[PDB]
Amino acid sequence: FKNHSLPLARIKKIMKADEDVRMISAEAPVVFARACEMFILELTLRSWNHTEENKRRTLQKNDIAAAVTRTDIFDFLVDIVPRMDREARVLRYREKRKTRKFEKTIRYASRKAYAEIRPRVNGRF
Amino acid sequence: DRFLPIANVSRIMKKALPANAKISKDAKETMQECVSEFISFVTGEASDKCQKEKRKTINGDDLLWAMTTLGFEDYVEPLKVYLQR
DNA sequence: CGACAATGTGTGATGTACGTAGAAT
DNA sequence: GATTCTACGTACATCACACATTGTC
Numbered sequence: 001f002k003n004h005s006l007p008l009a010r011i012k013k014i015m016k017a018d019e020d021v022r023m024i025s026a027e028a029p030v031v032f033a034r035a036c037e038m039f040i041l042e043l044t045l046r047s048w049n050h051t052e053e054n055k056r057r058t059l060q061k062n063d064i065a066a067a068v069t070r071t072d073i074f075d076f077l078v079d080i081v082p083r084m085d086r087e088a089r090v091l092r093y094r095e096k097r098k099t100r101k102f103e104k105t106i107r108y109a110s111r112k113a114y115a116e117i118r119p120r121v122n123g124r125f
Numbered sequence: 126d127r128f129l130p131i132a133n134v135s136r137i138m139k140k141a142l143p144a145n146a147k148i149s150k151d152a153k154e155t156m157q158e159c160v161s162e163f164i165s166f167v168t169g170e171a172s173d174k175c176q177k178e179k180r181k182t183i184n185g186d187d188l189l190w191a192m193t194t195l196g197f198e199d200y201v202e203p204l205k206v207y208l209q210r
Numbered sequence: 211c212g213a214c215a216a217t218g219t220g221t222g223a224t225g226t227a228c229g230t231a232g233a234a235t
Numbered sequence: 236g237a238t239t240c241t242a243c244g245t246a247c248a249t250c251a252c253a254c255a256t257t258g259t260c
Contacts, residue, residue, distance in 0.1 A: 002210075005133055005136075005137065006129055006130065006133040006134070006137075007129075007130065007133075007228090007229095007246085007247055007248085008247085008248080009246080009247050009248070010129055010130065010246090010247080011129075011164060013126065014127075014128075014129070014161055014164045014165060014168070015164065015165075015168045015183075017165060018165065018168050018169055018172055020169075020172040020173075020176060021168065021172055021183060022181045022182075022220095022255095023181055023182040023183065023218090023219060023220070023255080023256075024182075024183050024219080024220090025182055025183060025184045025185070025218080025219075026218085026219075027184055027185035027208065027210075028171075028183055028184065028185060028188055030207075030210075031185045031188050031189070031204060031207065031208065032164060032167075032188065034203075034204060034207050035167070035188070035192065035197075035200060035204060036129070036160045036163065036164065037137055038200055038203075038204075039160060039163055039197075039200075040134065040137045040138055040141065040156065040160060041137070041140075041141045043156070043159065044138045044141040044142065044156070045141055047152075048141075048142060048146075057145060057146055057147055058146075058147040058148065058149055058236090058237080059138070059142070059146070059147070059148045059149055059152045060149040060151060060152050061149065061151040061152050061154075061155045063152065064152055064155050064156065064159070065155075068159075072196070073195075073196040073197060074159075076162065076163075076166050077159055077162065080158060080159065080162060081155070081159075086194070086195070086196070089170065089173075089194075089195075092169070093165075093166050093169055093170075096165075096169050097162070097165065100165070102126060102127060106220095106221080107220075107221095108219095108220055108221075108254090108255075109221090110220095110221095110253080110254075110255090111219090111220045111221045111252095111253080111254085111255090112220085112221050112222075113221090114220095114221075114252080114253060114254095115220085115221040115222050115223095116221085116222070118221085118222085118250095118251070118252080119251085120222080120223065120224090120250085120251095121250085122223080122224060122225070122250090123222075123223030123224030123225080123249090123250085124223075124224075124225095124249055124250040124251090125221095125222090125249085125250040125251040125252080126246090130228085130229060130230090130246095130247095131229080131230085132228080132229050132230075133228095133229080147236095147237060147238080148237080148238095149236085149237080150236080150237070180256085180257080181255080181256065181257095182218080182219075182255090182256060182257080
């Protein structure tokens with residue numbers, strides 16, 4: 001029912017790469033789980049149309065590249081595949097892509113101190 | 126650690142494809158990179174809205190407003206249903 | 211407005227589900 | 236080159252609870 005497909009902790013890590021992110025609700029990873037799933041589904045089908053257009057039974061990277069270049073909703077991907085406001089936001093996204101921190105960063109060191117102090121059984125609180 | 130796990134992504138791709146179909150490994154890698162970049166895309170937009178609305182906690186409605194702003198409209202409504210917990 | 215109250219989320223350690231890495235088909 | 240299969244070996248999920256967060260007053 002709510003034992004999810006992909007890991008939520010990984011979605012949180014990917015989110016925390018943005019420095020403009022302080023607190024993440026529990027709703028957000030669960031939403032992104034199915035959001036990413038539906039994204040995979042749409043993109044895979046859009047690429048499979050091109051694979052069928054080449055009479056092939058295997059999905060290769062060039063199929064996904066063609067699917068990316070055909071539709072504008074995936075314009076943000078053009079920089080990652082071998083090939084009036086929303087576009088400016090896409091370039092803002094590109095600039096933010098360079099500034100990603102995957103290092104363990106503490107934001108509320110008070111919570112950290114309490115966690116160093118809290119009583120833990122088997123590592124759990 | 127910079128992308129989503131590949132086994133789950135590939136299984137999701139398989140769920141979209143017939144049993145006779147096959148998936149290149151390069152395609153799997155490209156797909157996982159694409160989904161992680163989509164996550165960071167939507168997260169940046171949600172953070173933009175939350176800064177503009179003087180909020181510090183990121184909620185589901187923020188994510189959906191971002192996704193709507195980003196053109197993934199047809200995603201939103203079933204995700205609205207998924208929200209109910 | 212900016213304070214009240216109530217709702218809610220960051221933070222580490224660890225067992226153990228689960229993804230990963232190779233050969234073989 | 237791409238799938239199955241088995242056994243490792245990693246990183247996910249889980250916990251309680253002091254105060255950050257929210258929107259409402």
